[PDB]
Amino acid sequence: TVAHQITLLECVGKGRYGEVWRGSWQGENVAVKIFSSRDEKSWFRETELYNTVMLRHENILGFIASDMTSRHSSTQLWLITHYHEMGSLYDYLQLTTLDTVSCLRIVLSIASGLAHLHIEIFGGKPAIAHRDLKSKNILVKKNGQCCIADLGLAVMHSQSTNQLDVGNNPRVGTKRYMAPEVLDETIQVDCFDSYKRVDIWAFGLVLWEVARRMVSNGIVEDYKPPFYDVVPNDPSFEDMRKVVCVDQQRPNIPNRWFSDPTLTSLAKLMKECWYQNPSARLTALRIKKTLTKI
Numbered sequence: 402t403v404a405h406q407i408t409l410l411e412c413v414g415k416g417r418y419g420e421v422w423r424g425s426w427q428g429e430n431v432a433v434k435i436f437s438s439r440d441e442k443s444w445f446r447e448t449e450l451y452n453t454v455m456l457r458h459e460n461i462l463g464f465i466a467s468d469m470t471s472r473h474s475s476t477q478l479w480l481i482t483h484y485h486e487m488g489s490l491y492d493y494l495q496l497t498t499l500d501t502v503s504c505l506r507i508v509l510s511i512a513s514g515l516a517h518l519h520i521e522i523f524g525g526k527p528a529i530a531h532r533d534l535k536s537k538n539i540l541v542k543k544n545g546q547c548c549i550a551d552l553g554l555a556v557m558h559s560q561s562t563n564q565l566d567v568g569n570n571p572r573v574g575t576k577r578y579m580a581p582e583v584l585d586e587t588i589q590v591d592c593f594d595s596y597k598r599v600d601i602w603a604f605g606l607v608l609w610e611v612a613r614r615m616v617s618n619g620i621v622e623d624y625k626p627p628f629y630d631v632v633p634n635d636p637s638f639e640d641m642r643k644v645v646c647v648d649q650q651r652p653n654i655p656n657r658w659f660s661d662p663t664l665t666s667l668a669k670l671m672k673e674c675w676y677q678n679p680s681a682r683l684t685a686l687r688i689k690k691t692l693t694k695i
């Protein structure tokens with residue numbers, strides 16, 4: 402099994418989900434996600450998605466293997482993928498600023514990965530919603546494009562059967578990026594499009610995160626996570642509910658963006674991701690089309 406051939410080298414990420422390690426396999430870097438015992442259903446769902454859906458795409462993290470192994474005489478669930486030395490988009494945006502070309506390339510590549518996920522393809526894949534899009538779940542590739550990672554919460558739908566497959570995972574999305582209908586708990590869980598629009602909301606927040614780091618008129622904003630100014634680290638459910646639903650707050654558009662053609666376009670995009678009413682938001686394909694034009 403691939404797990405027994407890998408040498409773990411250093412831990413590059415850690416959370417309640419478990420750990421991500423840079424490992425060595427066949428003399429190349431690979432990412433090894435070692436799930437915690439509390440998050441076995443995410444391992445199962447990711448393994449299911451990668452093994453039963455043809456998911457290869459330039460902007461979707463590339464799957465190598467999924468294994469059960471023994472470490473310290475007890476079972477570990479491993480998910481092995483391609484390694485991206487440039488790291489997560491979250492970490493990357495803190496280490497550099499962007500120019501116009503690099504900013505558009507990042508957000509367009511994310512829109513292409515997302516649209517590919519959302520679209521059903523025949524002759525071939527079901528439609529897939531992600532449900533935990535965020536800059537920590539997006540990796541930066543050496544060519545300046547990004548790829549979307551972590552399918553542990555994904556939901557699938559296929560037209561031939563009209564079957565919705567929401568999995569069996571008690572994990573919920575990252576609270577900071579949850580759409581209003583998730584926080585007020587009125588989202589219609591029996592309908593696939595409900596989940597696509599939860600992704601669109603989160604993608605709006607990612608767009609905002611990246612745009613702040615594009616230089617115009619020689620100035621740039623510091624990296625900040627969405628809603629940094631109004632919720633603490635690790636915000637609770639009620640924190641996000643108060644800010645997003647009750648007070649209807651949205652991320653602030655800096656004045657300097659409106660003096661730049663690109664950032665004004667991006668600002669209109671993200672605002673149409675943020676309607677309180679999910680039906681009003683743009684779709685991934687519409688966002689991809691618009692971004693390709695700018």
Ligand SMILES: COc1ccc(Nc2nccc(-c3c[nH]nc3-c3cccnc3)n2)cc1
Pocket residue numbers: 413414421432433434462480481482483484485486487488489492537538540550551
């Ligand atoms: C600054 O320190 C760092 C340097 C490099 C990296 N490189 C990297 N390469 C591939 C994947 C991931 C990753 C991040 N989040 N989740 C995954 C993942 C991995 C496997 C399966 N599913 C999700 N990170 C990370 C941190």
